[PDB]
Amino acid sequence: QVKLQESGPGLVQPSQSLSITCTVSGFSLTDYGVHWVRQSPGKGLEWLGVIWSGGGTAYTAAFISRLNIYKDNSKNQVFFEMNSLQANDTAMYYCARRGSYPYNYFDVWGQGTTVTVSSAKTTPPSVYPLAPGSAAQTNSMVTLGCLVKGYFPEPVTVTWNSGSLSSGVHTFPAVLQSDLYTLSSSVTVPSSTWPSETVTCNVAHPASSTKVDKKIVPR
Amino acid sequence: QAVVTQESALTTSPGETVTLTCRSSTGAVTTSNYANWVQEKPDHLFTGLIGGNNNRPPGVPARFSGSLIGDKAALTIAGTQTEDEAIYFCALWYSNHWVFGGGTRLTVLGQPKSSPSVTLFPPSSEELETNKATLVCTITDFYPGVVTVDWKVDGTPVTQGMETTQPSKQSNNKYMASSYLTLTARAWERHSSYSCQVTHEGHTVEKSLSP
Numbered sequence: 352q353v354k355l356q357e358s359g360p361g362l363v364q365p366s367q368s369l370s371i372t373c374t375v376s377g378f379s380l381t382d383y384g385v386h387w388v389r390q391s392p393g394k395g396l397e398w399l400g401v402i403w404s405g406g407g408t409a410y411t412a413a414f415i416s417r418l419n420i421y422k423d424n425s426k427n428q429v430f431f432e433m434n435s436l437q438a439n440d441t442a443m444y445y446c447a448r449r450g451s452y453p454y455n456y457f458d459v460w461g462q463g464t465t466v467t468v469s470s471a472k473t474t475p476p477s478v479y480p481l482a483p484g485s486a487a488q489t490n491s492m493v494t495l496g497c498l499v500k501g502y503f504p505e506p507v508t509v510t511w512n513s514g515s516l517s518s519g520v521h522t523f524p525a526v527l528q529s530d531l532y533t534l535s536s537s538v539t540v541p542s543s544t545w546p547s548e549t550v551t552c553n554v555a556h557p558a559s560s561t562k563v564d565k566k567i568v569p570r
Numbered sequence: 571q572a573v574v575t576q577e578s579a580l581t582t583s584p585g586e587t588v589t590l591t592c593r594s595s596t597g598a599v600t601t602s603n604y605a606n607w608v609q610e611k612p613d614h615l616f617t618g619l620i621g622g623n624n625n626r627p628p629g630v631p632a633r634f635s636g637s638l639i640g641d642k643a644a645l646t647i648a649g650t651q652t653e654d655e656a657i658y659f660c661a662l663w664y665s666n667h668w669v670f671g672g673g674t675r676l677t678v679l680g681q682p683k684s685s686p687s688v689t690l691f692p693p694s695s696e697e698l699e700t701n702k703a704t705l706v707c708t709i710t711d712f713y714p715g716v717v718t719v720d721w722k723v724d725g726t727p728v729t730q731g732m733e734t735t736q737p738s739k740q741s742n743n744k745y746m747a748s749s750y751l752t753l754t755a756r757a758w759e760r761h762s763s764y765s766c767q768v769t770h771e772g773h774t775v776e777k778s779l780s781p
């Protein structure tokens with residue numbers, strides 16, 4: 352029932368600002384406090400601030416002048432706004448709910464917003480269909496793939512047949528091939544499904560405005 | 571600003587009782603610090619375990635208990651389960667701000683061994699039009715998360731062109747990883763045998779290609 356929905360991936364240039372919206376459901380902001388926390392690629396958790404049920408706020412001392420958290424109770428939205436971002440502000444930012452006693456625990460968290468602070472060039476991914484080199488045996492399982500090569504920055508979303516396929520799907524962690532990322536995804540389906548029916552890889556990279564569909568064809 | 575210290579990592583076996591600690595640099599951890607504990611599971615998914623009054627959220631196992639032991643906050647897990655493999659963060663309240671500890675990674679041993687399922691993919695015809703060829707070797711369903719990948723062309727080993735990921739968890743608690751070998755379209759057309767060898771716990775599993 353309880354959800355904290357965060358706004359999409361954000362690429363920020365040094366000295367500029369960051370804005371994140373946490374849209375909540377299953378509870379009211381009039382009863383609960385919402386905290387903001389971050390986790391760097393090379394660290395653990397760092398608490399940034401909070402907006403309590405009553406509208407009151409608290410922040411980590413070093414952030415007073417650069418960070419603000421406010422809300423709109425009627426829209427069930429909490430807004431995070433931070434200025435003067437630096438390279439070390441690159442992290443996954445989360446909003447987390449916390450109630451008053453006996454509900455005084457950080458129970459439900461948002462999925463996180465990936466923030467990259469960089470003066471580097473945003474590169475779109477080159478999506479390539481991966482079909483097996485050999486034809487499948489009569490009445491068997493086939494493993495088809497999708498290569499997402501050379502992108503910056505993280506993340507990328509990969510689905511198969513618009514989300515219809517999931518059980519035989521594996522989406523692998525990204526690797527760093529010289530300032531650029533590369534990942535792959537596979538789907539294992541019965542030989543009676545493919546090439547008979549259409550199997551498509553759908554790839555999204557928010558930061559470069561790319562959304563491509565690559566149909567897996569034989570050879 | 572206070573620093574909150576936790577053990578970096580603890581390794582345990584199923585059924586063991588373990589105690590994670592949370593220390594304050596400004597002095598003793600007191601009841602007024604309302605110590606909270608949070609659990610982080612793979613794919614950056616966090617969930618609350620213990621509240622400020624040592625209270626557990628509905629659905630959190632009773633084996634998780636928060637307390638103060640002398641001058642430090644503590645999380646006692648009474649009978650570690652395999653599903654408790656995670657990073658545990660403590661958070662302390664200091665009158666007008668919360669401070670999270672650095673986290674304690676908990677590893678739980680004795681989980682069943684699972685051999686890797688390997689798949690080798692040839693480059694796309696679209697790839698070859700950019701005069702580049704990437705061979706993808708996917709590795710799934712293995713436990714423990716330690717694997718070595720060796721690539722061979724006609725039989726001769728190659729160190730150049732290869733890039734492999736660190737093992738990470740799947741939705742079923744086993745590990746996955748992937749390896750890439752980027753060659754030119756010219757090199758792909760020139761040779762006849764390419765191989766991906768995945769070694770796990772002494773045993774090697776291999777998948778090959780023939781143009």
Ligand SMILES: O=C(O)CN1CCN(CC(=O)O)CCN(CC(=O)O)[C@@H](Cc2ccc(NC(=O)CSCCO)cc2)CN(CC(=O)O)CC1
Nearest residue numbers: 384401403404405449450451452453455604621622623663
């Ligand atoms: O919450 C956190 O981050 C950390 N808390 C740690 C302590 N708490 C235990 C815990 O949290 O573990 C016990 C007290 N807390 C109730 C609860 O948690 O049961 C609230 C008591 C309270 C005091 C004053 C007001 N004043 C006003 O409304 C206007 S005052 C205008 C002055 O000119 C409202 C509520 C206050 N905590 C905000 C909130 O809980 O909403 C902030 C502190």
Ligand SMILES: [Cl-]
Nearest residue numbers: 602663665666
């Ligand atoms: Cl208080």
Ligand SMILES: [Y+3]
Nearest residue numbers: 450451452455
């Ligand atoms: Y409170």
